[PDB]
Amino acid sequence: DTLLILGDSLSAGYRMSASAAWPALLNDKWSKTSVVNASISGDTSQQGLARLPALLKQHQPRWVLVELGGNDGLRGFQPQQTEQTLRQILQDVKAANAEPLLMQIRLPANYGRRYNEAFSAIYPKLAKEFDVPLLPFFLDEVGLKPQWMQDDGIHPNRDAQPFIADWMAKQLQPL
Template sequence: MRWLSFLLVLTFSLQAQSARLLILGDSLSAGYQMSANQAWPSLLPQALQKYNHPMTVINASISGDTTGNGLARLPKLLQQHTPDYVLIELGANDGLRGFSPQIPERNLARIIDLIAQSGARPILMQIRIPPNYGQRYSKAFSTIYSKLSEQKQIPLIPFFLEQVILRPEWMKSDGLHPNEHAQSWIAAWIAQQLTPLLEPTPS
């Protein structure tokens, strides 16, 4: 009984120390055409543990989501999960559908504000779209993220796909989505990007 009590206390203690990270994303984070446990968000807690950052990761990503979809879902997610951090990986589908850049910019600004108002810390991921959409549109789209990062004074981390796409064996045949072989690398890379932005773990 004493050992059982000790283990229960230890479990609750570890849970109390573990921060909560909500990932608000699209198919790049949802694990497109693979099981959820293969996708990089499922591998992220172990990758963060190497940096002494125990983390509960809630993957709220849905394939096909636009910034508008993410904004609509966000209030309920914040209330349900009460995260400490929210990683925003949205915008690719807005770009692929040719939305005016003002639309994702407005939606992302509102997403950031809602996260901050909830007491969580927003972290924005840079998103870029394929160059075949035209240089003018691609540039206008990509600058949304640096602009919001500066305006809202929040961290901006690089777009992981820019590294993955250099390895054809890590990409699906559609040329847009990483396959299962890329997921552990993405998790390790995201952990490396997030670590400087996380609060020190209580000793």
């Protein structure tokens, strides 16, 4: 039984090998459930969708965690396009007889009010619409302690990955 992770940098591990990223650590903690990281750094929701048919056919997963949208805005997507692209992803996953698990995405910075509110709103909407688990953003409540950051202000470092895995383990275990 396979959990497919369809994410970006936060799941792929920015400037580190995938075997250092939290999905691989999650995998170890689990023979019971196999974990396959299909995440690629810098991914938009569009890129995720473009690969999804092939990945579903390849890994035939029972669950698919969707961690996408964070890169859409800086790539020039209006929130509507992000919404419709995620909708198609959820459709595809359901069609392939897998349970979508949708993670709420939190933006790093203020991109303005209209964009933030619109963007944030997409995920509760899609969760209700497809009646699928809406997971919170990576340790949303706690955030990430400063010592777990990389030289940029944004990406968790290699040392942070075990803690993210712990957290994800707890989120996913009832699903």
